[PDB]
């Protein structure tokens, strides 16, 4: 697929049985969701963005279905105004910036 | 050009005589720089990211040299940990996400 950027590049994901939408975000190192219940152990983490810092839970080896592809990666769960799919997942999608 | 996402997609830009680096950021609606001096008038604006909001100056019709292209767009100037090139500029670059 090719995704133009006239609009926010939002995609539908399925993670641990839950359906969500998220922004394909080349500026995000990590994948981050606000309201997502994930199972298992997690480590406390702080990430920093434009308006300051938020405390998140780091969950590892989380299954994600996105763009006709199933991938497994680290998902951070914490306050964010927008769910974001980070480079960690995009490199696995074989996703590139082309122009 | 094609930019893979194994590393942050940082690019060199020239804006109003000044040389800077910035992240090609599909999750950013707008282009934002921290330490860029721009000429003319501006409007006060607040943008929201992860962690909270920041006050920025909005400058219109700023020429930007990026990726062999000269483009002209709105640049927000304010506190950000990382300069980001937003979709406003990327659409002009003909820049797309491919996988
Ligand atoms: C500033 C970037 C280097 C990092 N940010 C990713 C970025 O794409 C966010 C992604 C984003 C999107 C919406 C809300 C919060 C964060 N966009 C953003 O802050 O854009 C601002 C400039 O344009 C405006 O348009 C949308 C928000 C404004 S980030 O959200 O802070 C971030 C940081 C670390 C991780 N792992 C994931 C995301």
Swiss-Prot record, chains A, B:
Active site positions, chain numbering: 25 (for protease activity)
Domain Peptidase A2: 20-89
Domain of life assignment: Viruses
UniProt-annotated stretches for the region Dimerization of protease: 1-5, 49-55, 88-99
Quaternary assembly: Homodimer, whose active site consists of two apposed aspartic acid residues.
Protein name: Protease
Species for this entry: Human immunodeficiency virus type 1 group M subtype B (isolate BRU/LAI)
